[PDB]
Structure formats: structure tokens, C-alpha cells
DNA sequence: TTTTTTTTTTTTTTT
């Protein structure tokens, strides 16, 4: 445990996905799926509050977590968690991306069900 | 402020540029710098590499104290939220607003004083 | 394995 003496970086962002999961599989047979999460919130800074809006291009790679994505529709309310990585050198400016290791959905069943059975009788 | 909406980034690395310390016409001291992260990771044994220069701002009186101590080369960890503005040309910029700092220099300084206090 | 240049209706924060 020597270099991990400055390798700590975890981002936890909840948000609604605005770009559907674009799946692909790289040569080694690994499957990955991207999308753009839109996060919006009120954040307090300096004893006051201000809005925090951001589009985070997240991507989930490898087997374990592919399933949970096949289940994330557009306008999904999710919280993703994993490391951040980026780059924008003037010889190929790529972008900031949250490689995800973990995701749980944030709209409760009792919640959504409400909006599926009520209009009727 | 509870609910779904949660934004927490906890980055570490070596302060690249600055820090530029200004007090703005609103009253508060603002300290801005850029943090250069570099690390290797992923679950079991698949090797991914990580790098990123996160513009950081430390806004308010509360945290400007610990600040007069970080300079280019300074290693620290910061925790706070990420917001994204327009820029001066390129649309969205990302900035981590630090709500909590950690000079990992004091970490070594504390581990040492332990290993060596006869 | 070149920090796998991978922003694919008007570029989501400007309705």
C-alpha cells in the first residue's frame, strides 16, 4: 500500500438519465453501456444555497452490473457511484466520465405503482 | 436537504496550478486551484488507470483558514460537491466546491510522530 | 490498448 497514498476518488451522483444506454462490447468481449445522467439539486455553500446542475456521462463496464442497466429507462431516477476520470488536451479533448461500480434505483415501487393504477375506477 | 439528489465527490492528488485567493464583492474569500489526480483501479483484477485535473474552489470564511497552507505540489484530499457552469468560450466547466479539506502532509506528519516518539 | 479522440433532432439549463 504505497502509491494509493493519493488515489482516493469516489463520486456519488444521483440524477435522472437523459441519454439512453448505448451498449457496445470491446474486443476482449467486455460489455459496456453509456448514458448521460442529469443531476440537479440545491446545494448550500457559505451558509447559503445555490443550484448544482450537471450532466455526467457515466458508463458501466464488465459483467456484474450490465443487468441493472438493461432496467434503466430514460427519465430514470438513479444514484450512481464509482470513480471519476477525464481529459481535454488540445489534441483530442475527450471528456469527464464517472466509471460506475454501483447503482440502485431511486423511485420507490409504492411510488410508481401509484401512477399506474389510480386513473381508472 | 435530504432526498434523491446527492452530490459528493472526494478527490485526492497534487495541486497543479494556483491557488488564487480572492475575496469577491459579496464579502467572502474565495480560493481557487486545480487538483491533479492520478491512480489505478477497478473491482477484482482488471486494470484501469485514472487521471483528472479538477478545478476546485474553496468558498467561504470557514475553510479559508486551512488554505494559506496549500501550494503547487501540495498533496491534499478535498470533499465537496460538483457544479457545472458556462465558461468563457467552451460551454460547461466542472468545479468541485470543497466543503472539507485534508492536507495529507499532516497525515504523514502524524504517522511519523508516532513511529518516532521514543 | 496511443488517458480504446464514443457528445448519435436544433447542440438542454436559454423555453
UniProtKB/Swiss-Prot annotation, chain B:
One of the record's GO molecular function terms: identical protein binding
Disruption phenotype: Called priB302; no growth phenotype, 2-fold decrease in recombination proficiency. Inviable at 10 ng/ml ciprofloxacin. Resumption of DNA synthesis after arrest of DNA replication (upon UV treatment) is slower than wild-type, no change in survival after UV treatment. A double priB-priC deletion causes a drastic reduction in cell growth and/or viability. Strongly reduced UV resistance and greatly increased SOS induction; when associated with 'R-230', 'Y-479' or to a lesser extent 'P-557' in priA. Synthetically lethal in combination with a polA, priC, rep or lexA deletion.
GO cellular component: DnaB-DnaC-DnaT-PriA-PriB complex; pre-primosome complex; primosome complex
Modifications made to the protein after synthesis: An intersubunit disulfide bond is seen in some crystals.
Span of the signal peptide: none
CDD domains associated with the record: SSB_OBF
Pfam families, per database record: SSB_1
GO BP annotation list: DNA replication initiation; DNA replication, synthesis of primer; plasmid maintenance; replication fork processing; response to radiation
Domain of life: Bacteria
Effect annotated for changing residue 30 to A: No change in ssDNA binding, decreased displacement of PriB from ssDNA by DnaT fragment, greatly decreased binding to DnaT fragment (residues 1-88). Does not complement a priB deletion in a priA300 mutant in vivo
Triggers of expression: Induced by hydroxyurea.
Known outcome of mutating residue 43 to A: No longer interacts with PriA, still dimerizes and binds ssDNA, altered binding to DnaT, does not load DnaB replicative helicase. Does not fully complement a priB deletion in a priA300 mutant in vivo
Domain SSB: 6-105
L45 loop, short sequence motif: residues: 86-93
Keyword entries, A-Z: Disulfide bond, DNA replication, DNA-binding, Primosome, RNA-binding
Disulfide-bond pairs as recorded: 52-84
InterPro entries xref list: NA-bd_OB-fold, Primosome_PriB/ssb, Prisomal_replication_PriB
NCBIfam families: PriB_gamma
Similarity-based family: Belongs to the PriB family.
Domain remark from Swiss-Prot or TrEMBL: Displays high structural similarity to the ssDNA-binding domains of single-stranded binding protein (SSB). Unlike SSB binds ssDNA in a shallow groove on its surface where DNA contacts both monomers. The L45 loop (residues 82-89) plays a significant role in ssDNA binding. PriB's binding sites for PriA, DnaT and ssDNA overlap on the surface of PriB.
Subunit structure: Homodimer. Primosome assembly occurs via a 'hand-off' mechanism. PriA binds to replication forks, subsequently PriB then DnaT bind; DnaT then displaces ssDNA to generate the helicase loading substrate, which allows DnaC to load helicase DnaB onto the fork. ssDNA is displaced from the PriB-ssDNA complex by DnaT. In a PriA-PriB-replication fork structure, movement of the PriA CRR domain exposes a surface to which PriB binds and contacts ssDNA emerging from the PriA pore. Binds PriA; binding is improved in the presence of ssDNA.
Functional summary from the UniProt entry: Involved in the restart of stalled replication forks, which reloads the replicative helicase (DnaB) on sites other than the origin of replication; the PriA-PriB pathway is the major replication restart pathway. There are several restart pathways, the PriA-PriB pathway is subdivided into 2 distinct pathways. priB and priC have redundant roles in the cell. During primosome assembly it facilitates complex formation between PriA and DnaT on DNA; stabilizes PriA on DNA, presumably by preventing or inhibiting PriA DNA translocation activity.
Full protein name: Replication restart protein PriB
Source organism: Escherichia coli (strain K12)
Amino acid at each position: 500500500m504505497d502509491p494509493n497514498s493519493l488515489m482516493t476518488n469516489r463520486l456519488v451522483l444521483s440524477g435522472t438519465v437523459c441519454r439512453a444506454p448505448l451498449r457496445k462490447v470491446s474486443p476482449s468481449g467486455i460489455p459496456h453501456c453509456q448514458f448521460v445522467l442529469e443531476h440537479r439539486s440545491v446545494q448550500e455553500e457559505a451558509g447559503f444555497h445555490r443550484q448544482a446542475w450537471c450532466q455526467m456521462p457515466v458508463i458501466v463496464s464488465g459483467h456484474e452490473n450490465q443487468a441493472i442497466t438493461h432496467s434503466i429507462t430514460v427519465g430514470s431516477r438513479i444514484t450512481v457511484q464509482g470513480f471519476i476520470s477525464c481529459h481535454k488536451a488540445k489534441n483530442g479533448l475527450s471528456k469527464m466520465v464517472l466509471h460506475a461500480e454501483q447503482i440502485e434505483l431511486i423511485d420507490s415501487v409504492d411510488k410508481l405503482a401509484a401512477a399506474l393504477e389510480h386513473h381508472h375506477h
